[PDB]
Amino acid sequence: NYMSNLPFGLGYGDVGKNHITEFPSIPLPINGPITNKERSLAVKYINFGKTVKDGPFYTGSMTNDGIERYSDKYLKKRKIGISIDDHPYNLNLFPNELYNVMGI
Amino acid sequence: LVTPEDVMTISSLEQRTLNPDLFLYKELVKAHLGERAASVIGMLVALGRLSVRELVEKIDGMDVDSVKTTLVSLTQLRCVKYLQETAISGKKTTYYYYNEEGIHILLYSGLIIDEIITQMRVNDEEEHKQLVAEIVQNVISLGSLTVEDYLSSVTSDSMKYTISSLFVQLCEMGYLIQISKLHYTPIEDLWQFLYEKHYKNIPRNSPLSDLKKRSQAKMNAKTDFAKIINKPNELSQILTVDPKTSLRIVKPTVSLTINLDRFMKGRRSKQLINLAKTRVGSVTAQVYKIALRLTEQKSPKIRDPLTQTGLLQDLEEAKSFQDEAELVEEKTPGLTFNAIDLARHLPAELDLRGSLLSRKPHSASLINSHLKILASSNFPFLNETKPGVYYVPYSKLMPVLKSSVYEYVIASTLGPSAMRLSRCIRDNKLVSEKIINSTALMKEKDIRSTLASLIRYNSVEIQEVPRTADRSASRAVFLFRCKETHSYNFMRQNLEWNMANLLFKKEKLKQENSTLLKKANRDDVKGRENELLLPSELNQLKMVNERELNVFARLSRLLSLWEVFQMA
Amino acid sequence: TEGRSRDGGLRLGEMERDCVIAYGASQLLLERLMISSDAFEVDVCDKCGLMGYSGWCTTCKSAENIIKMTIPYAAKLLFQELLSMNIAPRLRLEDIFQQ
Amino acid sequence: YKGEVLGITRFGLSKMRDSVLQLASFEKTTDHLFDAAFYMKKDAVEGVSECIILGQTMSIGTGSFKVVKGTNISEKDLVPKRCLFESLSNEAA
Amino acid sequence: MKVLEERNAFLSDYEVLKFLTDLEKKHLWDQKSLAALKKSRSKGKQNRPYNHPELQGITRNVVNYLSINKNFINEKSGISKMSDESFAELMTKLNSFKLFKAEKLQIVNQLPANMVHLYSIVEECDARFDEKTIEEMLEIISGYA
Amino acid sequence: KEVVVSETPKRIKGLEFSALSAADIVAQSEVEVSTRDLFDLEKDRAPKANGALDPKMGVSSSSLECATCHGNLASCHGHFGHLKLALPVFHIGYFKATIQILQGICKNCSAILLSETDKRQFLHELRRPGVDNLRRMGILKKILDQCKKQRRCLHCGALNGVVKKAAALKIIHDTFRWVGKKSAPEKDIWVGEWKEVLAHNPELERYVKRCMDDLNPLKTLNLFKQIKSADCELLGIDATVPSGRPETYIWRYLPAPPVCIRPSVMMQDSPASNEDDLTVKLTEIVWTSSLIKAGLDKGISINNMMEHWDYLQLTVAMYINSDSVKPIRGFCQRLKGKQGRFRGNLSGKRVDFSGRTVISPDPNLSIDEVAVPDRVAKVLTYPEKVTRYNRHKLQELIVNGPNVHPGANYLLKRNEDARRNLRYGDRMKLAKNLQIGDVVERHLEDGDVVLFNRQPSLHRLSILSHYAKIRPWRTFRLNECVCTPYNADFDGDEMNLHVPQTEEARAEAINLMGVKNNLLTPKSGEPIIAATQDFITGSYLISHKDSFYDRATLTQLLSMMS
Amino acid sequence: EKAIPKDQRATTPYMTKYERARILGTRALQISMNAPVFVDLEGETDPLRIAMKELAEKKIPLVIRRYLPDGSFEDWSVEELIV
Amino acid sequence: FILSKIADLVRIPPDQFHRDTISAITHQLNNKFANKIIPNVGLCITIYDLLTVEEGQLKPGDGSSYINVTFRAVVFKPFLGEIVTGWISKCTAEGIKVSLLGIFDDIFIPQNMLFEGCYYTPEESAWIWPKLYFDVNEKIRFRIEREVFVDVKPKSPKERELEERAQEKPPAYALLGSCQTDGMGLVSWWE
Numbered sequence A: 001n002y003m004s005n006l007p008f009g010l011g012y013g014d015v016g017k018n019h020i021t022e023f024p025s026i027p028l029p030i031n032g033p034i035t036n037k038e039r040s041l042a043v044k045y046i047n048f049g050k051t052v053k054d055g056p057f058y059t060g061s062m063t064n065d066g067i068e069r070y071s072d073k074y075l076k077k078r079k080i081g082i083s084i085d086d087h088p089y090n091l092n093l094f095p096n097e098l099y100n101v102m103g104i
Numbered sequence B: 001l002v003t004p005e006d007v008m009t010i011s012s013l014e015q016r017t018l019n020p021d022l023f024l025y026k027e028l029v030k031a032h033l034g035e036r037a038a039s040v041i042g043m044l045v046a047l048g049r050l051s052v053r054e055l056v057e058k059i060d061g062m063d064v065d066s067v068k069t070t071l072v073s074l075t076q077l078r079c080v081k082y083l084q085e086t087a088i089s090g091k092k093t094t095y096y097y098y099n100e101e102g103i104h105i106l107l108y109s110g111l112i113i114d115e116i117i118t119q120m121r122v123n124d125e126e127e128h129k130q131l132v133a134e135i136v137q138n139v140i141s142l143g144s145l146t147v148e149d150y151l152s153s154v155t156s157d158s159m160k161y162t163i164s165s166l167f168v169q170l171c172e173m174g175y176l177i178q179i180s181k182l183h184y185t186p187i188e189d190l191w192q193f194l195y196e197k198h199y200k201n202i203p204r205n206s207p208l209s210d211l212k213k214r215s216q217a218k219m220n221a222k223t224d225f226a227k228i229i230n231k232p233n234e235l236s237q238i239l240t241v242d243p244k245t246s247l248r249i250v251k252p253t254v255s256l257t258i259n260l261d262r263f264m265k266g267r268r269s270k271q272l273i274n275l276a277k278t279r280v281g282s283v284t285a286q287v288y289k290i291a292l293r294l295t296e297q298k299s300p301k302i303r304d305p306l307t308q309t310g311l312l313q314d315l316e317e318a319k320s321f322q323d324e325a326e327l328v329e330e331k332t333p334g335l336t337f338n339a340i341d342l343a344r345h346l347p348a349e350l351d352l353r354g355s356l357l358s359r360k361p362h363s364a365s366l367i368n369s370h371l372k373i374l375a376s377s378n379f380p381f382l383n384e385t386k387p388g389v390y391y392v393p394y395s396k397l398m399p400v401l402k403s404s405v406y407e408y409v410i411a412s413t414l415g416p417s418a419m420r421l422s423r424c425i426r427d428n429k430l431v432s433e434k435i436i437n438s439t440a441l442m443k444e445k446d447i448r449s450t451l452a453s454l455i456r457y458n459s460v461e462i463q464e465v466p467r468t469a470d471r472s473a474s475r476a477v478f479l480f481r482c483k484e485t486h487s488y489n490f491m492r493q494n495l496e497w498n499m500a501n502l503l504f505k506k507e508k509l510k511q512e513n514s515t516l517l518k519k520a521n522r523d524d525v526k527g528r529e530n531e532l533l534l535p536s537e538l539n540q541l542k543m544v545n546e547r548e549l550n551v552f553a554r555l556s557r558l559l560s561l562w563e564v565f566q567m568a
Numbered sequence C: 001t002e003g004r005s006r007d008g009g010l011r012l013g014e015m016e017r018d019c020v021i022a023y024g025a026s027q028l029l030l031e032r033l034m035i036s037s038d039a040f041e042v043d044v045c046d047k048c049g050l051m052g053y054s055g056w057c058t059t060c061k062s063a064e065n066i067i068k069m070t071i072p073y074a075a076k077l078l079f080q081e082l083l084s085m086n087i088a089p090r091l092r093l094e095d096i097f098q099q
Numbered sequence D: 001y002k003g004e005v006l007g008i009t010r011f012g013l014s015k016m017r018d019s020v021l022q023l024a025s026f027e028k029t030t031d032h033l034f035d036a037a038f039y040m041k042k043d044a045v046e047g048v049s050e051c052i053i054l055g056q057t058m059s060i061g062t063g064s065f066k067v068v069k070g071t072n073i074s075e076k077d078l079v080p081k082r083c084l085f086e087s088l089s090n091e092a093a
Numbered sequence E: 001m002k003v004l005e006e007r008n009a010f011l012s013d014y015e016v017l018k019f020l021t022d023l024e025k026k027h028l029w030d031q032k033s034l035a036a037l038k039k040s041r042s043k044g045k046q047n048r049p050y051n052h053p054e055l056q057g058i059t060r061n062v063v064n065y066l067s068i069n070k071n072f073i074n075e076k077s078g079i080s081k082m083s084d085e086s087f088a089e090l091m092t093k094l095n096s097f098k099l100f101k102a103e104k105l106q107i108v109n110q111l112p113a114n115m116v117h118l119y120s121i122v123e124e125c126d127a128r129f130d131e132k133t134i135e136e137m138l139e140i141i142s143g144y145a
Numbered sequence F: 001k002e003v004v005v006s007e008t009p010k011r012i013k014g015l016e017f018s019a020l021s022a023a024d025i026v027a028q029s030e031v032e033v034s035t036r037d038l039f040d041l042e043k044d045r046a047p048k049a050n051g052a053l054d055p056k057m058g059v060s061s062s063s064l065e066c067a068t069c070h071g072n073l074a075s076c077h078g079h080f081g082h083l084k085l086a087l088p089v090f091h092i093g094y095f096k097a098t099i100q101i102l103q104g105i106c107k108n109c110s111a112i113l114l115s116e117t118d119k120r121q122f123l124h125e126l127r128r129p130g131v132d133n134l135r136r137m138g139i140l141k142k143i144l145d146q147c148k149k150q151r152r153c154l155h156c157g158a159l160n161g162v163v164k165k166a167a168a169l170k171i172i173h174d175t176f177r178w179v180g181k182k183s184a185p186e187k188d189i190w191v192g193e194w195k196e197v198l199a200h201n202p203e204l205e206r207y208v209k210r211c212m213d214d215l216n217p218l219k220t221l222n223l224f225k226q227i228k229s230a231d232c233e234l235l236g237i238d239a240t241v242p243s244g245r246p247e248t249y250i251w252r253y254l255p256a257p258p259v260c261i262r263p264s265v266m267m268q269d270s271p272a273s274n275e276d277d278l279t280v281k282l283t284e285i286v287w288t289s290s291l292i293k294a295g296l297d298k299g300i301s302i303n304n305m306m307e308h309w310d311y312l313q314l315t316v317a318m319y320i321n322s323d324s325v326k327p328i329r330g331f332c333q334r335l336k337g338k339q340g341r342f343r344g345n346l347s348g349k350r351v352d353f354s355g356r357t358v359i360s361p362d363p364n365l366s367i368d369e370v371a372v373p374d375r376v377a378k379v380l381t382y383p384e385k386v387t388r389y390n391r392h393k394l395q396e397l398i399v400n401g402p403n404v405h406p407g408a409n410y411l412l413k414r415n416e417d418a419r420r421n422l423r424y425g426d427r428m429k430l431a432k433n434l435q436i437g438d439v440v441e442r443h444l445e446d447g448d449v450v451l452f453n454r455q456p457s458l459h460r461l462s463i464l465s466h467y468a469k470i471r472p473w474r475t476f477r478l479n480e481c482v483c484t485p486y487n488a489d490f491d492g493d494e495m496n497l498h499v500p501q502t503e504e505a506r507a508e509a510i511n512l513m514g515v516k517n518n519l520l521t522p523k524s525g526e527p528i529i530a531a532t533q534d535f536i537t538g539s540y541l542i543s544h545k546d547s548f549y550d551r552a553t554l555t556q557l558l559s560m561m562s
Numbered sequence G: 001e002k003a004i005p006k007d008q009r010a011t012t013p014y015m016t017k018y019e020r021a022r023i024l025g026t027r028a029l030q031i032s033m034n035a036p037v038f039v040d041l042e043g044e045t046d047p048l049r050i051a052m053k054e055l056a057e058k059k060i061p062l063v064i065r066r067y068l069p070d071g072s073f074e075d076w077s078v079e080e081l082i083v
Numbered sequence H: 001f002i003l004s005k006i007a008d009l010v011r012i013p014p015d016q017f018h019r020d021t022i023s024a025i026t027h028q029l030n031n032k033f034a035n036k037i038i039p040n041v042g043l044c045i046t047i048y049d050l051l052t053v054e055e056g057q058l059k060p061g062d063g064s065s066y067i068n069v070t071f072r073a074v075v076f077k078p079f080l081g082e083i084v085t086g087w088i089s090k091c092t093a094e095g096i097k098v099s100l101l102g103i104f105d106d107i108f109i110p111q112n113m114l115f116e117g118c119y120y121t122p123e124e125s126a127w128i129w130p131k132l133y134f135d136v137n138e139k140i141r142f143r144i145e146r147e148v149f150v151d152v153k154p155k156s157p158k159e160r161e162l163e164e165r166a167q168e169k170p171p172a173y174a175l176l177g178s179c180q181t182d183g184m185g186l187v188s189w190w191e
Ligand SMILES: [Mg+2]
Pocket: F488, F489, F490, F491, F492, F493
């Protein structure tokens, strides 16, 4: 009745429990320490990508009151960001379906 | 018991069901560019070819302008390949791909600037290091960089006189190739536009037949495709001009884009040098760093000369492609070098005197000794064509090198007995349940534990032995097989998935501490963090920052094992 | 139940269903088949088309997108049996009104 | 009407329906069900068989139209009223 | 249930009070709810099968807050006795003064009899104007008081 | 506080069929079935956590607690379990699916058997607004036939052939079907590989036949994860959403159905509780899974594990579809058949408020009436809601109560959740306190709308709506003119009575299915309700030319007629 | 989704049997939910018979919305639909 | 105190078909938005008027009339500088509970932003100023700077069971105020 098909080298107490561990864990050697070079590599990764976030190529956007306050009147702005159309590009490097978003 | 709510919270089983290729690309584009760009790139991964209409239809963003602006941004980032398929009976439209190598810049960025900094001849002075670092960051970030803008932005005449001098060096080396249709068009579409025109201009009643006209059409296509791919892969036509009463300069109106194949060759040679550093002592290993440094600049292809991606290789006489590849490697003398030529680049700090023992000073008879010993070494690093001058082969070096890497990765993940068993299956084709004991002589329980552990992957393929008209593996024995190609498939996807997970976790950490990271990346906060930040929040920020430093180190360390598997 | 001894009900078979459809009596169809045989007030998530419980999606774990609706208990049983074979018959909803 | 003579059989009925539930309720249940799950068919609920199975109202007979109760509310009672502040402030600007 | 827009035409704190006064005078009376007789309508669930809890409470709290004396000083209600014309006659001065801000609503119900109150009502009043037009506006706004 | 709670009336718009990914199977599940035990002696046969009969996936009786919803069998909606499987398995339902998925991709590089421009045009045709199931199946047949025809994978041509199944339940691909009188580097590899074994055994010389590329669950599954996403549309699986991957169709997690799906029947044979087939099967599946889980660490004989791994592929077959040689009842047998799921429960089922007895004639009934026994009128009720128009009547019915026929059996108060049985409780008070929201389940009365049905139902006139007429005897009586639509003949024929329970259904019944509205058959327009035998003969004998009547006889005839 | 103006209506000006049955059922349901009636009951207590009387007097306040297969609809008050 | 335009579906029972339809609709809207606060909009005082009323529809099983309605509802919405004379009713040593006359009283004002001299002591000593203060249950003047709507609310059924066996963010409309400008704090500091 499917409970006598037990091979000889298999103990009888270690069956039935099942319940494989939550995540199989084997410590890889790719979790080593840090050096001057590794610290500098992390710092240069920090500068990069952050640079493009602070640049125009974001395309990820989806206190909003009805009146501009007197405090908002004659006030410093957030930032005059350089827009997607602002920076000059190469026209002959895009399909003709995208040129219209340029301020040619 | 771990709760199903406790699971899926720290276990991360929802991501385990993603295809690893999509996961990594999506996470890179998300953490670097943004969210809408991530959605677009993921949809591109799902559907290889589509139009802007189909993106509008398939993503929540229907705003035709919004998808367009994200697409021009992604195209700049070299993440998109496009084309125009000509509808004849109405309006002809376009289709956009996803360019895999356009995101490897976003993946290799740290290694990219590391190669750009380190590989140069002059690095003692500090200012040049910072200058080239900022220029390479600006180029890899913005994309197609224009000297017309760059010189205009530069403010000092004495400083404009050297940035123009660095562009020629990168163009000639191979880190700056003129950008054109070849980086923004798919290989199969190139070949299918170069493969039917030859079938349109042929006359009729030609005394040949379908097989003959097809073979000559394929020959003509291969010739023109090889020519037009050679033309922009490396040339002087960007800087071949020379202005009057001035210096040699690249053209001021054109754009410059930084390549990645040259950096991939640099990384591969770095892996070879590290292999030598583990295996061969540094006395004669310091030569190999420069021995490959001076040949990589004109080194041949690593996986595909791009004719093996847009079309089928062959069925009968299918040896032709590797035949011609090894034939070209043999014929081209640029890769062959003599003991005299190697002398003018070796630094003095390498003595080249005590690197030999003839029994139990920058001299050619000693550097040629290392040349010959590398050729005669068990791993065919170089092959001997002529007595005195040899060459490094890639016809029979990549398979054995990749198999060594695969074997040692499995051995690092598993035990020495697992390595012994995988090596038995490798060096003995068609092992069986008794040939294992014949060729191993290790205790059966341990060997079969390692066997069961290694079965789960694509390393070892197992054959069902049919004994009666019904096929059953329950009455008869069953022996083993290798089928190594699946094994190479497997190590690509697992590593790609793990890098995807790492990017996913750093994006999670950014999501969890967005306010803190935005505060950190502020002009006044930069450089002044001790007085401003109160001790508790400063401790939280420093701990999360060292965590991300460590995880970037982990990612970079994993960035030395998967690109080598990426080769064919 | 199916037994006259077990106080069973009288089956309304496929041919009687065909007759009622041929009459075009939609509300009578609903009353005889669903309401007066097995009407189950299930909770349906509007994100995943999967029946929950107690207004709890138990896959989104939200209680946000849980709609309350009445379906035949036989239909609920069919969905739970399909999920057993791993088949996911996800229900897509929409407002009855709003024209 | 589909252009080909289609039978009233389990093969002829697989004409244009995509109706996994109607096909199941007719014949060959598990094959159709696993097929629809495998190709991820997104059939609408329009058949009277599916309406009955799901306890929905069929679109036939008394379910083929809508019943609407008029509000009998005019246009002279839907007028916004007693609003001066907006115009007063705008002219104060 | 979707909110078509978040902010519609501003309301001064006199229209709201007259509306709540109208609501109490039209139904859910407080004077008659203070007399016994819950049965009343006898239609099955009280007066004409309806009742108004959770609306009477807030419509009493809002009117109570507006009907307590305007807090210029620690005698009238503050908003009740002014009429539509008592607010209409102020046009020729309300548009006479300049603020370039919808903060008209701040001073039309609260903070009279002090300069500093308006000094918080309009940020940087002194920088914009502190010459002579700092007492006439106070006299106008306290005119009801 | 009290943020606004909003509800919207919604209808089912459609169904998205798909397979649950591994993540979704765990996510929907609320407890993990991992032990082969359901009851233990040490717990006095009380089901506890992690067993097959774990209460956290439901309860089998009203005396228990789910502990997921803490509800009885009456109110628990059922909750899912999941199974962890070591050495995963194939799927019986999607066996041909997995096959056809393999015929499209080369198994070496896991790339599709098409050029990067071969069927992209048919893909562009596949997104046309005009597609049906027929056109979809046709285009999929086209791409399948083409990728089957193709032999060399463009990435790496490895001579794909047939990927048929065994004559067993395993899938085999002929790696070297179309190779003959030709040479290949893979071919020299194959020959040398069989020289390595033909030089080590003295008996495999005959058996080196066959032994093609066999595809097990593990091999196919790990190969499936190699497949990229850009080709899944060609394989026909929308990869936009998770579980659109082609690796989800491989059994890797078994979801354990709620015990409501597989109930445990009380008091069958022995006093000890008995279980059911699906639960027993899943207990076997769990036991085998745990055995293999331990055998990964003890190194079971590789032959026996393959035997067990073939069993796990067999137990699930019965668990899903008992087709293979046999009483085991699988999920494909709960759905299939006359008394299965669809044809037995979903469109056609047992109904409440119905009756059945012998029919007798009644020529004094109107043709649009049926005489209903007072005995069945006292059990068949109509749920009349109290208005300002019928309150006095409903109070009188409540006072009469469940036994006097113009009475009532149940009262559902306006603001309560259950009905008050009127056999007890001093109905005199309940009538006084009767409100305008109350539902009184009062007896079937004269003029009530009933459905009348004689089986088999040939045409639509096999069921008609009649006005109920309460009468003393135990038969349904009908006027003989309406015997023709029912095809009834008073020789022991029985007919079924249905009482619609809603106002809408009642109005629909009496206005569309009413006898007077259905005097004609829709097939020809000819009358079908009309005089039957003795009525025809009596009419003939009256109108016969020899019939004459004096005034007395004539007026008596007219009084009989009225 | 567009309402065809009462000026140009293409569907039948006759109440169909299905529309009559549905109108009676809906109105009887409303009455059973204590909706006010607009006819003299004369001892009638049953919602369906009350609704039949209202239909006979053409006093049922409901509108038939006849959706065309293209999605457009037209509104026919029960009074104007001729029986 | 400003208006807001909302779209809703209102179920009118046949009980209410006798009263005028506008009255019935506004009664149902009042039922739904009497003291209730809209998610991330504000607190609905009551309904002001009605804008769009569609012909009521009937589902085949209810009998009620469901009307798509667009209306304006009066809601309390301070934005950045609105004045309100608080009437507090509780004071903890983490920020006083700026309370109103039963409208909503679940708002706090942060001490770091509050008057610098204004400090709390564990032994209940009111304030120290570098010479005058205020006590509990008096008139307080402050400002408005940021609005936060508590909109996180997941609860498992077992969580609800354990919670009600044992038996926080009480509101979804929390306010806060500043006391940086002279004159804020009392109705009468001088004169
Ligand atoms: Mg008979």
